[PDB]
Design a protein around this motif. Sequence first.
Motif, PDB file in Angstrom:
ATOM      1  N   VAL A   1      -3.691  -4.430  20.073  1.00 38.77           N
ATOM      2  CA  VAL A   1      -3.282  -4.483  21.479  1.00 38.77           C
ATOM      3  C   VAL A   1      -3.694  -5.815  22.096  1.00 38.77           C
ATOM      4  CG1 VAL A   1      -3.755  -3.541  23.784  1.00 38.77           C
ATOM      5  CG2 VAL A   1      -3.181  -2.009  21.842  1.00 38.77           C
TER       6      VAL A   1
ATOM      7  N   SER B   1      -1.488  -8.460  20.698  1.00 36.40           N
ATOM      8  CA  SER B   1      -0.136  -8.420  21.237  1.00 36.40           C
ATOM      9  C   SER B   1      -0.079  -9.046  22.624  1.00 36.40           C
ATOM     10  CB  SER B   1       0.407  -6.980  21.253  1.00 36.40           C
ATOM     11  OG  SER B   1      -0.096  -6.211  22.340  1.00 36.40           O
ATOM     12  N   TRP B   2      -1.056  -8.762  23.487  1.00 34.36           N
ATOM     13  CA  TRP B   2      -1.050  -9.395  24.796  1.00 34.36           C
ATOM     14  C   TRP B   2      -1.194 -10.913  24.684  1.00 34.36           C
ATOM     15  CZ3 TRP B   2       1.227  -7.523  28.619  1.00 34.36           C
ATOM     16  CH2 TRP B   2       1.238  -6.143  28.849  1.00 34.36           C
TER      17      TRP B   2
ATOM     18  N   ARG C   1      -0.161 -12.769  22.201  1.00 35.25           N
ATOM     19  CA  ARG C   1       1.126 -13.287  21.742  1.00 35.25           C
ATOM     20  C   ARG C   1       2.121 -13.369  22.892  1.00 35.25           C
ATOM     21  NH1 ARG C   1       1.687 -15.571  16.357  1.00 35.25           N
ATOM     22  NH2 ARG C   1       1.624 -13.843  14.855  1.00 35.25           N
ATOM     23  N   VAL C   2       2.109 -12.370  23.778  1.00 31.86           N
ATOM     24  CA  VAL C   2       3.005 -12.375  24.929  1.00 31.86           C
ATOM     25  C   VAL C   2       2.661 -13.527  25.861  1.00 31.86           C
ATOM     26  CG1 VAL C   2       3.671 -11.094  27.020  1.00 31.86           C
ATOM     27  CG2 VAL C   2       3.494  -9.911  24.797  1.00 31.86           C
ATOM     28  N   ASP C   3       1.368 -13.733  26.113  1.00 30.63           N
ATOM     29  CA  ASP C   3       0.940 -14.882  26.912  1.00 30.63           C
ATOM     30  C   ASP C   3       1.454 -16.179  26.296  1.00 30.63           C
ATOM     31  OD1 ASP C   3      -1.042 -16.049  29.091  1.00 30.63           O
ATOM     32  OD2 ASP C   3      -1.735 -16.945  27.218  1.00 30.63           O
TER      33      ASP C   3
ATOM     34  N   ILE D   1       4.102 -16.618  24.384  1.00 32.74           N
ATOM     35  CA  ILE D   1       5.556 -16.734  24.505  1.00 32.74           C
ATOM     36  C   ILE D   1       5.919 -17.274  25.879  1.00 32.74           C
ATOM     37  CG2 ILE D   1       7.685 -15.431  24.753  1.00 32.74           C
ATOM     38  CD1 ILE D   1       6.485 -13.599  22.436  1.00 32.74           C
ATOM     39  N   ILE D   2       5.286 -16.725  26.915  1.00 32.34           N
ATOM     40  CA  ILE D   2       5.566 -17.161  28.271  1.00 32.34           C
ATOM     41  C   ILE D   2       5.111 -18.598  28.480  1.00 32.34           C
ATOM     42  CG2 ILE D   2       4.881 -16.787  30.654  1.00 32.34           C
ATOM     43  CD1 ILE D   2       4.952 -13.691  29.760  1.00 32.34           C
TER      44      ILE D   2
ATOM     45  N   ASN E   1       5.070 -20.891  26.278  1.00 31.61           N
ATOM     46  CA  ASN E   1       6.051 -21.725  25.590  1.00 31.61           C
ATOM     47  C   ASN E   1       7.359 -21.765  26.368  1.00 31.61           C
ATOM     48  OD1 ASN E   1       4.152 -22.187  23.620  1.00 31.61           O
ATOM     49  ND2 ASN E   1       5.022 -20.809  22.109  1.00 31.61           N
ATOM     50  N   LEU E   2       7.754 -20.638  26.957  1.00 34.61           N
ATOM     51  CA  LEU E   2       8.928 -20.654  27.821  1.00 34.61           C
ATOM     52  C   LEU E   2       8.763 -21.677  28.935  1.00 34.61           C
ATOM     53  CD1 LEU E   2       9.601 -16.857  28.127  1.00 34.61           C
ATOM     54  CD2 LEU E   2      11.133 -18.512  27.065  1.00 34.61           C
ATOM     55  N   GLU E   3       7.611 -21.662  29.607  1.00 34.00           N
ATOM     56  CA  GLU E   3       7.391 -22.603  30.700  1.00 34.00           C
ATOM     57  C   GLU E   3       7.386 -24.037  30.196  1.00 34.00           C
ATOM     58  OE1 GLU E   3       3.748 -20.912  31.903  1.00 34.00           O
ATOM     59  OE2 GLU E   3       4.598 -19.470  33.317  1.00 34.00           O
TER      60      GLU E   3
ATOM     61  N   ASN F   1       8.945 -25.293  27.231  1.00 35.74           N
ATOM     62  CA  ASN F   1      10.291 -25.675  26.807  1.00 35.74           C
ATOM     63  C   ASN F   1      11.194 -25.899  28.013  1.00 35.74           C
ATOM     64  OD1 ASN F   1       9.011 -24.999  24.427  1.00 35.74           O
ATOM     65  ND2 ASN F   1      10.259 -23.172  24.008  1.00 35.74           N
ATOM     66  N   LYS F   2      10.883 -25.228  29.130  1.00 30.12           N
ATOM     67  CA  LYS F   2      11.579 -25.497  30.388  1.00 30.12           C
ATOM     68  C   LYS F   2      11.296 -26.912  30.885  1.00 30.12           C
ATOM     69  CE  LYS F   2      11.475 -23.991  35.252  1.00 30.12           C
ATOM     70  NZ  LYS F   2      10.785 -23.113  36.242  1.00 30.12           N
TER      71      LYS F   2
ATOM     72  N   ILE G   1       1.006  -0.354  17.843  1.00 29.67           N
ATOM     73  CA  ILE G   1       1.161  -0.524  19.303  1.00 29.67           C
ATOM     74  C   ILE G   1       2.147   0.525  19.822  1.00 29.67           C
ATOM     75  CG2 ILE G   1       1.773  -2.064  21.153  1.00 29.67           C
ATOM     76  CD1 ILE G   1      -0.604  -2.899  19.426  1.00 29.67           C
TER      77      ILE G   1
ATOM     78  N   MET H   1       3.815   0.567  25.745  1.00 31.01           N
ATOM     79  CA  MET H   1       3.200  -0.729  26.005  1.00 31.01           C
ATOM     80  C   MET H   1       4.132  -1.866  25.611  1.00 31.01           C
ATOM     81  SD  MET H   1      -0.220  -2.148  24.274  1.00 31.01           S
ATOM     82  CE  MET H   1      -1.171  -0.738  24.894  1.00 31.01           C
TER      83      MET H   1
ATOM     84  N   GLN I   1       5.665  -5.007  27.800  1.00 28.42           N
ATOM     85  CA  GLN I   1       5.612  -6.415  27.403  1.00 28.42           C
ATOM     86  C   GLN I   1       7.004  -7.043  27.424  1.00 28.42           C
ATOM     87  OE1 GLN I   1       3.381  -6.310  23.719  1.00 28.42           O
ATOM     88  NE2 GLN I   1       1.407  -6.127  24.769  1.00 28.42           N
TER      89      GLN I   1
ATOM     90  N   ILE J   1       8.142 -10.202  29.788  1.00 29.03           N
ATOM     91  CA  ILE J   1       8.724 -11.420  29.228  1.00 29.03           C
ATOM     92  C   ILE J   1      10.058 -11.732  29.933  1.00 29.03           C
ATOM     93  CG2 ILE J   1       9.835 -12.362  27.198  1.00 29.03           C
ATOM     94  CD1 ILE J   1       7.624 -10.854  25.525  1.00 29.03           C
TER      95      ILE J   1
ATOM     96  N   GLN K   1      11.731 -18.308  35.607  1.00 30.60           N
ATOM     97  CA  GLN K   1      11.869 -19.719  35.260  1.00 30.60           C
ATOM     98  C   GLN K   1      13.244 -20.264  35.636  1.00 30.60           C
ATOM     99  OE1 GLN K   1      10.776 -19.361  31.215  1.00 30.60           O
ATOM    100  NE2 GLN K   1       8.640 -18.835  31.706  1.00 30.60           N
TER     101      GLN K   1
ATOM    102  N   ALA L   1      10.646 -19.275  21.723  1.00 34.32           N
ATOM    103  CA  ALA L   1       9.309 -19.271  22.295  1.00 34.32           C
ATOM    104  C   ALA L   1       8.338 -18.430  21.483  1.00 34.32           C
ATOM    105  CB  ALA L   1       9.369 -18.744  23.732  1.00 34.32           C
TER     106      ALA L   1
END
Lengths: 109, 110
Positions: free
Chosen positions: A89, A92-93, A95-97, A99-100, A102-104, A106-107, B4, B8, B12, B16, B23, B38
């Motif tokens: 868990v 996973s959080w 990894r999500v952080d 991804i976001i 990287n989104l910001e 790559n923007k 997981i 949850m 997520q 995302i 953005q 990403a």
Amino acid sequence: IPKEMLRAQTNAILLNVLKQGDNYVYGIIKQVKEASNGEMELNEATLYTIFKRLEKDGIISSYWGDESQGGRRKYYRLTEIGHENMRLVSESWSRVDKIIENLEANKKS
Amino acid sequence: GAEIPKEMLRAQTNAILLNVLKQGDNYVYGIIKQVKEASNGEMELNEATLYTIFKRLEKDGIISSYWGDGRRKYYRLTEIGHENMRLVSESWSRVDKIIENLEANKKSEA
Ligand SMILES: [Cu+2]
């Protein structure tokens, strides 16, 4: 905020509390209240629903013991499976952080 | 078991997707491509899954859609969507401090 993200965040919190050692429902609520400077008051009914699911999944186990006023109390423990669930868990959080983040990035590019 | 829970993961995914729209406005193929990049290929979102999610977010007033200049269908975060993202990110930061405080109090007791 919708139920789902609050519920997801509560679940993450409860797993990190149980990671620290065995505990009981009312004690968890107290500790989370203190750790939140009094702002997060979890409802015992929420914990009962969550702890029912986690017990079924094998993530927590329970046992009975004494308490101070002389009665009997149900205590909960993070199992080995539960320690891995906790790690996944948290992974996973993170990894999500990423991804976001990287989104910001790559923007901006 | 230990994996997981889907509840949850759905949280997520929504987080995302709402950050992608925060953005900038975007269309489904573009959202999927950007999230794939990403996540270094590890998160390939399914178009039908996005439509399920977008249907509910539109019902709730969090996003809306409009046509671009074959026209693409663009999705945008609403003014309400932007506020709910401010709230969501606030709790995120607060949860992390609470966990930090729990950890910190654990170390003290030792
Ligand atoms: Cu966290």
